[PDB]
Design an enzyme around this catalytic site. Sequence first.
Site, PDB file in Angstrom:
ATOM      1  CE  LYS A  34      -4.149  -2.068   0.826  1.00  0.00           C
ATOM      2  NZ  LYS A  34      -3.600  -3.446   0.997  1.00  0.00           N
ATOM      3  CB  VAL A  35       3.910   2.241  -1.926  1.00  0.00           C
ATOM      4  CG1 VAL A  35       4.949   3.362  -1.786  1.00  0.00           C
ATOM      5  CG2 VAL A  35       4.568   0.857  -1.866  1.00  0.00           C
ATOM      6  N   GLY A  54     -17.711 -10.281   2.429  1.00  0.00           N
ATOM      7  CA  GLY A  54     -19.043 -10.379   1.859  1.00  0.00           C
ATOM      8  C   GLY A  54     -19.127 -10.465   0.347  1.00  0.00           C
TER       9      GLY A  54
HETATM   10  O1  LIG Z   1      -9.652  -2.586  -0.700  1.00  0.00           O
HETATM   11  C1  LIG Z   1      -8.941  -3.467  -0.251  1.00  0.00           C
HETATM   12  C2  LIG Z   1      -7.593  -3.541  -0.619  1.00  0.00           C
HETATM   13  C3  LIG Z   1      -6.830  -4.542  -0.093  1.00  0.00           C
HETATM   14  O2  LIG Z   1      -5.539  -4.640  -0.429  1.00  0.00           O
HETATM   15  N1  LIG Z   1      -7.369  -5.442   0.800  1.00  0.00           N
HETATM   16  C4  LIG Z   1      -6.518  -6.530   1.298  1.00  0.00           C
HETATM   17  O3  LIG Z   1      -7.022  -7.759   0.727  1.00  0.00           O
HETATM   18  C5  LIG Z   1      -6.995  -8.811   1.717  1.00  0.00           C
HETATM   19  C6  LIG Z   1      -8.419  -9.242   2.118  1.00  0.00           C
HETATM   20  O4  LIG Z   1      -8.235 -10.403   2.919  1.00  0.00           O
HETATM   21  P1  LIG Z   1      -9.648 -11.073   3.414  1.00  0.00           P
HETATM   22  O5  LIG Z   1     -10.217 -12.066   2.308  1.00  0.00           O
HETATM   23  O6  LIG Z   1      -9.190 -11.901   4.680  1.00  0.00           O
HETATM   24  O7  LIG Z   1     -10.668 -10.065   3.731  1.00  0.00           O
HETATM   25  C7  LIG Z   1      -6.213  -8.259   2.924  1.00  0.00           C
HETATM   26  O8  LIG Z   1      -4.826  -8.608   2.787  1.00  0.00           O
HETATM   27  C8  LIG Z   1      -6.468  -6.735   2.831  1.00  0.00           C
HETATM   28  O9  LIG Z   1      -5.384  -6.002   3.388  1.00  0.00           O
HETATM   29  C9  LIG Z   1      -8.677  -5.366   1.101  1.00  0.00           C
HETATM   30  O10 LIG Z   1      -9.172  -6.178   1.867  1.00  0.00           O
HETATM   31  N2  LIG Z   1      -9.445  -4.382   0.606  1.00  0.00           N
END
Ligand SMILES: O=c1cc(O)n([C@@H]2O[C@H](COP(=O)(O)O)[C@@H](O)[C@H]2O)c(=O)[nH]1
Lengths: 219, 219
Positions: free
Chosen positions: A69-70, A183
């Site tokens: 997430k730079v 979701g």
């Molecule tokens: O909008 C975004 C952008 C992301 O990078 N992420 C990343 O995507 C991943 C989602 O993981 P999860 O399926 O456990 O919710 C996490 O690593 C989170 O940091 C997100 O959930 N929403």
Amino acid sequence: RRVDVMDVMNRLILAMDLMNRDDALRVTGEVREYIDTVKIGYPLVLSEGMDIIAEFRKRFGCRIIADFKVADIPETNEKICRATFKAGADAIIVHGFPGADSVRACLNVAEEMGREVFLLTEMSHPGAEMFIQGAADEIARMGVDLGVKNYVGPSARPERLSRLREIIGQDSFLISPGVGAQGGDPGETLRFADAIIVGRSIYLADNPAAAAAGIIESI
Amino acid sequence: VMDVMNRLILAMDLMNRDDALRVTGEVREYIDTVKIGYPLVLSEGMDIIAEFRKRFGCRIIADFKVADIPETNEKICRATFKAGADAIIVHGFPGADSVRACLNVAEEMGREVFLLTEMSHPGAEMFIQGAADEIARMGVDLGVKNYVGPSARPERLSRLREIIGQDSFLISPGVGAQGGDPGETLRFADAIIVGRSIYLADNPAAAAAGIIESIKDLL
Ligand SMILES: O=c1cc(O)n([C@@H]2O[C@H](COP(=O)(O)O)[C@@H](O)[C@H]2O)c(=O)[nH]1
Ligand SMILES: O=c1cc(O)n([C@@H]2O[C@H](COP(=O)(O)O)[C@@H](O)[C@H]2O)c(=O)[nH]1
């Protein structure tokens, strides 16, 4: 499916956010049959070190996206991207919100090192509605202006995800988190995204392999 | 509250352990608070934080510009506080839930969160600047007490100070290399953050001494 770009295996990217090297390696090994592309972020890297990236690449022969997430000034962004590509990441995820020069700094390093930048234009969590959502279209158009071809956008209402695709074009490559725990539906998201990103639904499952296979089955 | 020593915080963005340790050791006389970011951490490891705290007896602010969803934010904060950071810098643009996630971990571990409300680089004008007042107000609403805002026109920094109140603690980068003036910034900020003007100096101690001399009346 596309002749211009190869899909990641099963169009499914594992978000490996476990913070223990043993656990992260085990779960990744358990779904490698299904997934050839892993997103590694700060939870794992800050816990186990940057060497984890090269370890994953060697053990699993997978692609690695560094989800860092730079979001700093151009000068600092350049240093972060350099360290990240030196560590063996195939791509790095960069925030668009800090503006064009910050993104360009990352693109410059990616060009120098023969790697890729993914531009994050819009996010999946409720807080994203406060500031990011209002800028999302403009951030995506900025990406297009800069020549960015790789984007991150969230699983969302069709009218919304479609707008992103309209901006970036069908030739861009789009990967989308928010599937499963947050979701989002895998199938619906893949109507617009090239790949979906899934973390907890897989890595917190009693049976990670079954969760992955189950997701792939649902599509 | 007690001022940071000489109201001056070192941005240690060198990417070599001995060079980072040396320069910091050379200016320790003048500065007792150090900002460590991803350039140093991604090159030398998270253990560098505890090494600095032990060697120099300084407070460490982890400049990780945390900018993820709440669940990932919580993991990043946990790892960072476990590594011994006294505070972490978090982006406000991703919204209130992402910030509250960090505040919650900070509460659990006895540490502090600094909210980044606005940035110093040109790209910051594109999206961040237009949201900065509201990000600051969101901070106030969440009970944030520590803030980061850029060395800039008195009007800009004055407006931030207005929002966060006199009781809040405000630190400001963009001084020196980026054109910011130490004295004018300290009109509104409690401390200034300085990187290249010190760490790339032929004589870092001398550079640090000079800055402090130039603000003698404000100490
Ligand atoms: O909008 C975004 C952008 C992301 O990078 N992420 C990343 O995507 C991943 C989602 O993981 P999860 O399926 O456990 O919710 C996490 O690593 C989170 O940091 C997100 O959930 N929403
Ligand atoms: O708005 C901001 C916020 C920052 O954290 N920074 C950080 O503050 C430091 C500025 O260092 P320098 O004095 O060399 O410009 C860097 O670590 C940069 O990442 C900034 O420059 N502008």
